[PDB]
Design a protein around this ligand. Structure first.
Ligand SMILES: *[C@@H]1O[C@H](CO)[C@@H](O[C@@H]2O[C@H](CO)[C@@H](O)[C@H](O)[C@H]2NC(C)=O)[C@H](O)[C@H]1NC(C)=O
Ligand SMILES: *[C@@H]1O[C@H](CO)[C@@H](O[C@@H]2O[C@H](CO)[C@@H](O)[C@H](O)[C@H]2NC(C)=O)[C@H](O)[C@H]1NC(C)=O
Ligand SMILES: *[C@@H]1O[C@H](CO)[C@@H](O[C@@H]2O[C@H](CO)[C@@H](O)[C@H](O)[C@H]2NC(C)=O)[C@H](O)[C@H]1NC(C)=O
Ligand SMILES: *[C@@H]1O[C@H](CO)[C@@H](O[C@@H]2O[C@H](CO)[C@@H](O)[C@H](O)[C@H]2NC(C)=O)[C@H](O)[C@H]1NC(C)=O
Ligand code: CLR
Ligand code: NAG
Ligand code: NAG
Ligand code: NAG
Ligand code: NAG
Ligand code: NAG
Ligand code: NAG
Ligand code: NAG
Ligand code: NAG
Ligand code: NAG
Ligand code: NAG
Length: 1234
């Protein structure tokens, strides 16, 4: 009751012996089943051989050598049955015969027993061969897979769907393969197969069942011609024959010019200047060796007369100064603050602003996104064995119980209402939500909400349904798991192929894509996803519109609800969430948190002054000698000047921000306090002779020190005003406020402070204690005189320090090239914000990046044949058409940051117009003849197509195009016509009143972006692609000479600043060095040496700062730019005072001159500037924010240390060698004054 032998040359059945008894109720033509006959093969000749050779030549083995195991009647039945599939595959016959070969071999092969094992026996009649209902067959995997592939992409004659999609049963082309297709052909459950055939795809490598040889015969590839027919399958039908497009080439690294690396040009260009100026100084010294009224007196006399008159009348000047300061400060009532960080940290005018304006004008603003993530805390991944797909792995988060809870949370969020005080009413979701369909007369069901549960239309009942169905020999149950797996691989469908014939589209009328519902998966293993995503979209608006405020109120309630849920579900799963406004609020909160800490930092500075300028008598006599009055005076005058500058700018109408308020007084005080300290110290050091009154003494003191304060003030203020060139509002506002504040500080110091000091001296001479309650040499003068100066200036020390500092400069000059560029949001957040968890979840689980739009401007004719030819990607299109270029670019996501190929309204429009789709029809009779008749009208009053049937590509005329396009754009999709533009293209085409297109867009997605370098590189690659597209579209005749396309995305406005060669601050910082040289040169009497030495010192300090900044891993950005401008200003306090003090000296030799300047001015500068700056920085270590600790604490400590090391060590030595000569006029004036 089986076939004992299965070796070779013997078959298992020959003659047809009647109809199949087991199958009943088919009511269709079927081949008569043969009964078992295990006999040798029959010789086939004559007309039987003629038919056998005719149908499938592969079995022909010579005119009188052919054997076969089939009859002519069986062949006629075979031809009749096969004719339907043969008709279907008409597009490329070459592979179709291969399919036919598969059947005829199975029917007639003389070596039938080597691959067919009969397994079913039915006894038709006594003493007759028993009928065979079913059997099994053996094949090799590679044979069947290649045979499948030969027609796997072949289209039907209509050219829309794939032929394979009509031959894989329950599912279409999306989920079919060789095994499933072969199983379909042999399974009688479809009402078509005549008998049950089991198809085993035995692997060729491992031979497991012995005695059976799986087969593998001749298979014709697509591009292999069948002799001289020269009718290979076009690559539109099987894709194997299409030409290969070479991969994108590697590009050179950025920042290059000419034939060399860019930065290398900079260093030589920089270094040469450093060499050149140095040479000049040496030349001057050599000339000296070979050869061997002044402004100081005018300024001295002027300031002495000014100071004595001011000191005489202290109450009047103090009153007038106070009144002026209050009069300016009062302006703060008009203050307006900007809080949006993108407006603060981005240029107001650029290419991106133009593109944003155009996009917003023609298509409307980009929507707001509110998003949550959830992943399971503890579960174990399990397995499920489905009838359709086999054994699949499911993650813990995809458990049935969890989904119901998530459905409840989503349902609570949709209904939610908020109280609006201005509107005095409850704002609902449908008042502000974004909806792609029905923007007016909307309802709650239309609002755009993306989630996994959209595959079940949020219907709890549908999620819980199960059903029984039978697939070949197995009957079993199906549930939600199968439906989700089916929808994931085929997002657009109006019904499944299972018993649960539900649609997979969202309730609001659009398909939901897997990368928007789940995340944390590789490949196409959607069931293994780890995180679930729920996203709400809200409409944006102009700022003036009141509705935005209402929208913001809704977001507040959203955040509250999530926090409540987070508490309730603390142990089950872990959630992460964010709202659109959250970042704007979160950063601002941080600023408020650190406002008292800075405040503490100012008062500590006060205390230092009171001790530094004080005295004692053996111990603990602070109550009398400590200068509390002068400390309070200095601090109040400087902070008054700062408030006056802010008030003035508020009067003018310039906005400000919390950052400016936070950091301007600190940076201003750090320089302004030092003029006060130096002046007071000089006053204490200078004795007076009997007869002199204190007013003359104070006058003479101001005459002594006022030109140094004037020179330093002018240099600092001009440098700060030159800082205000970068377009970024924060930096421009900072620079202008600091520039005005320093000037007002200077003017106040020369009036109110002098008066206060005069009154303090008056109180001191009368031996009265301060209102709080022997002129011995100071330790600093003794220490510098006896220990420091004889040591530093020693003959065996100077070349060592010179070589050490020049080597340090060289090494830092090299190191300064390794700069990290960019600002990351992660720093700007508090150490415990929920946004940290949100960003970490985005970085690990989200599979796609931001969307990008390629927007097409006016000036292009889409109504012509050439226009369509160059844009869409159908059978008759250009090989490198726009859509094809984007699709190609999407295949190499690492070279060009595009992950998902763009859609195209033109291809869907042309496809929709096709007569065979029954989508564009018109009424044929009655009151509405020649009007549009929608596809949902099932009457018989419409039998006429929009277009007449033709051959080849479908192209409308201009009249048809302009008449029918507004109908296409408003057709909702349905089961009768899956294509249409209402659910996807409604707002992507802007039409004119005469039917012309003004603008259009093509939408695509980026690959995941994780840091600022990926956003920058994505912008570079996308702009390069858009440039190539415009460059080729401009060759089409008839277009406007100024037609272009551009890549809009929401993030471009901020990130565009990093695309240049010099990262914006280099030009301004380089420019800021000029006022040092110019002011120093002019004020000191046209002294070339002082100017050159000051400029070189400032340059060396800034290069060292940038080098060490690179070595300590601090990135370059606008905040670093602010601090570097401050450093350029501050270093003048370390250089200028010593330079001027050395220059104005009457000692006969340079070495002698250096010593006195070093001891007196060195000790005053050290005690003032260094000790002023260190306590106001060390306090900031407790700021509790990463932004402040990285860019203010460490960077200012670095700047201060480099300042002191260059100022007090290098500068005296270089002055000792190359300093200026003696001013002879001063010598003559000194001698005559006798
Ligand atoms: C299609 O583009 C035109 C471009 O002009 C849009 O017309 C502008 O619409 C805005 C908003 O209503 C107005 O402020 C402008 O004044 C309009 N411009 C002109 C010249 O009238 C038009 O709105 C766009 N279509 C859609 C549906 O937004
Ligand atoms: C959620 O799904 C259920 C299941 O189909 C819907 O219930 C059916 O609705 C149709 C249309 O009104 C009725 O004819 C059936 O009798 C309902 N069946 C049952 C068991 O009630 C339900 O309407 C869906 N929810 C919504 C809001 O439409
Ligand atoms: C799906 O099939 C199962 C199995 O036949 C049905 O469950 C019942 O199972 C018991 C065995 O425990 C049988 O004795 C019953 O005859 C089965 N009932 C029926 C109606 O077949 C289950 O009810 C079926 N479900 C659906 C929706 O068809
Ligand atoms: C795009 O090109 C087509 C084809 O030339 C233009 O259609 C012609 O338009 C002119 C005037 O608009 C008519 O007189 C012709 O009869 C049209 N048909 C032809 C030549 O077959 C169409 O106008 C162009 N669109 C634009 C915006 O210029
Ligand atoms: C002060 C500085 C740091 C502000 C930085 C602003 C930038 C980097 C922020 C502001 C708005 C943000 C975008 C808001 C919306 C989304 C959609 C989301 O699906 C992908 C991320 C994306 C596209 C964000 C990218 C980053 C973004 C552009
Ligand atoms: C099968 O055999 C019967 C008996 O000769 C015949 O009438 C019938 O036409 C055959 N073919 C079929 C059912 O396709
Ligand atoms: C072939 O079929 C017979 C029954 O017809 C069965 O007993 C035998 O095990 C089968 N052989 C293989 C290798 O499956
Ligand atoms: C047909 O295409 C395949 C693709 O792998 C290629 O290897 C083969 O050489 C091609 N044959 C011809 C004749 O072009
Ligand atoms: C899984 O997590 C829960 C949550 O606390 C815990 O109680 C349970 O013990 C965990 N399972 C194992 C095996 O540790
Ligand atoms: C998932 O299923 C496949 C096939 O059933 C199996 O090989 C794999 O080990 C499974 N993974 C887990 C984690 O169970
Ligand atoms: C808004 O909804 C709350 C919910 O109970 C209700 O108490 C309140 O009265 C509503 N507001 C208005 C204006 O109806
Ligand atoms: C979580 O919320 C639900 C409904 O608001 C409530 O029934 C449940 O008790 C809450 N959980 C806890 C732990 O209170
Ligand atoms: C459009 O494409 C077809 C097919 O390549 C070509 O024959 C035709 O010349 C092209 N141009 C126009 C204006 O139809
Ligand atoms: C189709 O052909 C008929 C007969 O030639 C003609 O009357 C009709 O206008 C044609 N329609 C189109 C859209 O070309
Ligand atoms: C556009 O890209 C292609 C990529 O192969 C390149 O060969 C071509 O030079 C680019 N530029 C154009 C067409 O201006």
């Amino acid at each position: 009751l089986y076939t004992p032998k299965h070796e070779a040359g013997v078959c298992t059945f020959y003659e047809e012996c009647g109809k199949n008894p087991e199958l009943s109720g088919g009511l269709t033509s079927l081949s008569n089943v043969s009964c078992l006959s295990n006999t040798p093969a029959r010789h086939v000749t004559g007309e039987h051989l003629a038919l056998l050779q005719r149908i499938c030549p592969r079995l022909y083995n010579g005119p009188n050598t052919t054997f076969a195991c089939c009859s002519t009647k069986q062949l006629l039945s075979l031809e009749s049955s096969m004719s339907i599939t043969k008709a279907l595959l008409t597009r490329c016959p070459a592979c179709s015969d291969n399919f036919v070969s598969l059947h005829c071999h199975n029917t007639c092969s003389p070596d039938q027993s080597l691959f067919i094992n009969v397994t079913r026996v039915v006894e038709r009649g006594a003493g007759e061969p028993p009928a065979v209902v079913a059997y099994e067959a053996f094949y090799q995997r590679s044979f069947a897979e290649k045979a499948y592939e030969s027609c796997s992409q072949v289209r039907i004659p209509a050219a829309a769907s794939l032929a394979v999609g009509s031959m894989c049963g329950v599912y279409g082309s999306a989920l079919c393969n060789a095994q499933r297709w072969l199983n379909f052909q042999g399974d009688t459950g479809n009402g078509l197969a005549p008998l049950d055939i089991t198809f085993h795809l035995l692997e060729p490598g491992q031979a497991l069942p012995d005695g059976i040889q799986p087969l593998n015969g001749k298979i014709a590839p697509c591009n292999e011609s069948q002799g001289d027919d020269s009718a290979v399958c076009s690559c539109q039908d099987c894709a194997a024959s299409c030409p290969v497009i070479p991969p994108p080439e590697a590009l050179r690294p950025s920042f290059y010019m000419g034939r060399m690396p860019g930065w290398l040009a900079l260093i030589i260009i920089f270094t040469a200047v450093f060499v050149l100026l140095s040479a000049v100084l040496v030349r001057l010294r050599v000339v000296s060796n070979r050869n061997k009224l002044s402004p100081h007196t005018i300024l001295g006399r002027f300031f002495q007369n000014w100071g004595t008159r001011v000191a005489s009348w202290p109450l009047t000047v103090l009153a007038l100064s106070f009144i002026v300061v209050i009069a300016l400060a009062a302006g703060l009532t008009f203050i307006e603050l900007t809080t949006d960080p993108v407006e603060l940290w981005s240029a107001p005018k650029s290419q991106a602003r133009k593109e944003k304006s155009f996009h917003d004008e023609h298509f409307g603003p980009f929507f707001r996104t509110n998003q949550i993530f959830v992943t399971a805390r503890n579960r174990s991944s399990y397995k499920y064995d489905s009838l359709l797909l086999g054994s699949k792995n499911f993650s813990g988060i995809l458990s049935l119980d969890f989904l119901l809870e998530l459905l409840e949370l989503q349902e609570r969020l949709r209904h939610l209402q908020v109280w609006s005080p201005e509107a005095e009413r409850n704002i609902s979701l449908q008042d502000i939500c974004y909806a792609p369909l029905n923007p007016y007369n909307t309802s709650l069901s239309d609002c755009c909400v993306n989630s996994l549960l959209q595959y079940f239309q949020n219907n709890r009942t549908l999620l819980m349904l199960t059903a029984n169905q039978t697939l070949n020999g197995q009957t079993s149950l199906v549930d939600w798991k199968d439906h989700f797996l089916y929808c994931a691989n085929a997002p657009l469908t109006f019904k499944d192929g299972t018993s649960l014939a539900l649609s997979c589209m969202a309730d609001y009328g659009a398909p939901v894509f897997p990368f928007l519902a789940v995340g944390g998966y590789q490949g196409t293993d959607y069931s293994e996803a780890e995180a679930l995503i729920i996203t709400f979209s809200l409409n944006n608006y102009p700022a003036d519109d009141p509705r935005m405020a209402q929208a913001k109120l809704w977001e507040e309630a959203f955040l509250k609800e999530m926090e409540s849920f987070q508490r309730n579900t603390s142990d089950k799963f872990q959630v992460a969430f964010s709202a659109e406004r959250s970042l704007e609020d979160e950063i601002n909160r941080t600023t408020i948190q650190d406002l008292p800490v800075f405040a503490v930092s100012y008062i500590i500075v006060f205390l230092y002054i009171s001790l530094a300028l004080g005295s004692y008598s053996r111990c603990s006599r602070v109550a009398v000698e400590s200068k509390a009055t002068l400390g309070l005076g200095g601090v109040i005058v400087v902070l008054g000047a700062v408030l006056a500058a802010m008030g003035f700018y508020s009067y003018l109408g310039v906005p400000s921000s919390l950052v400016i308020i936070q950091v301007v007084p600190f940076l201003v005080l750090a320089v302004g306090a030092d003029n006060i300290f130096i002046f007071v110290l000089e006053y204490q050091r200078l004795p007076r002779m009997p007869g002199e009154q204190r007013e003359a003494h104070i006058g003479r003191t101001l005459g002594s020190v006022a030109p140094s304060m004037l020179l330093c003030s002018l240099s600092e203020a001009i440098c700060f005003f030159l800082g205000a060139l970068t377009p970024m509002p924060a930096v421009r506002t900072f620079a202008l406020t600091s520039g005005l504040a320093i000037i007002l500080d200077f003017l106040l110091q020369m009036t109110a402070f002098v008066a206060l000091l005069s009154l303090d001296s008056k109180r001191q001479e009368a031996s009265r204690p301060d209102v709080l309650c022997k002129e011995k040499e100071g330790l600093l003068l003794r220490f510098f005189r006896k220990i420091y100066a004889p040591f530093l200036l020693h003959r065996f020390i100077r070349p060592v320090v010179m070589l050490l500092f020049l080597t340090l400069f060289g090494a830092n000059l090299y190191l300064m090239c390794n700069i990290n560029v960019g600002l990351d949001q992660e720093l700007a957040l508090p150490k415990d914000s929920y946004l940290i968890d949100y960003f970490l979840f985005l970085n690990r689980y989200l599979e796609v990046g931001p969307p990008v739009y390629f927007v097409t401007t006016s000036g292009f004719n889409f109504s012509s044949e050439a226009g369509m030819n160059a844009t869409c990607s159908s059978a008759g299109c250009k090989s490198f058409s726009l859509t094809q270029k984007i699709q190609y670019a999407s295949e190499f996501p690492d070279q060009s940051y595009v992950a998902i190929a763009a859609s195209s309204w033109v291809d869907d429009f042309i496809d929709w117009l096709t007569p065979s789709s029954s989508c564009c029809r018109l009424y044929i009779r009655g009151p509405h003849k020649d009007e549009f008749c929608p596809s949902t009208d099932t009457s018989f009053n419409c039998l006429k197509n929009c277009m007449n049937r033709t051959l080849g590509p479908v192209r409308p005329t201009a009249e048809q195009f302009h008449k029918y396009l507004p109908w296409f754009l408003n057709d909702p999709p349905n089961i009768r016509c899956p294509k249409g533009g209402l659910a996807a293209y409604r707002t992507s085409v802007n039409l004119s009143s005469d039917g012309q297109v003004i603008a259009s867009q093509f939408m695509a997605y980026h690959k995941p972006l994780r840091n600022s370098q990926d956003f920058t590189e994505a912008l570079r690659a996308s702009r390069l692609l858009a440039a190539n597209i415009t460059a080729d579209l401009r060759k089409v005749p008839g277009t406007d000479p100024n037609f272009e396309v551009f890549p809009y995305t929401i993030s471009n406005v901020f990130y565009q600043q990093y695309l240049t060669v010099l990262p914006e601050g280099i030009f301004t910082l380089a420019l800021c060095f000029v006022p040092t040289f110019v002011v120093c040169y002019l004020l000191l009497g046209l002294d070339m040496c002082s100017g050159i030495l000051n400029l070189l010192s400032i340059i060396m300090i800034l290069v060292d700062t940038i080098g060490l900044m690179a070595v300590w891993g601090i990135s370059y950005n606008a905040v670093s730019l602010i601090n570097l401008v401050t450093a350029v200003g501050m270093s003048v306090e370390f250089v200028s005072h010593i330079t001027r003090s050395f220059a104005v000296s009457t000692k006969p030799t340079r070495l002698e001159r250096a010593k006195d300047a070093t001891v007196f001015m060195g000790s005053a500068v050290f005690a003032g500037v260094a000790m002023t700056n260190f306590p106001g920085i060390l306090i900031l270590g407790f700021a509790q924010a990463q932004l402040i600790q990285i860019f203010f604490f460490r960077l200012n400590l670095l700047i201060t240390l480099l300042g002191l090391l260059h100022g007090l060590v290098f500068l005296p030595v270089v002055l000792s060698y190359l300093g200026p000569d003696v001013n002879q006029a001063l010598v003559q004036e000194e001698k005559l004054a006798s």
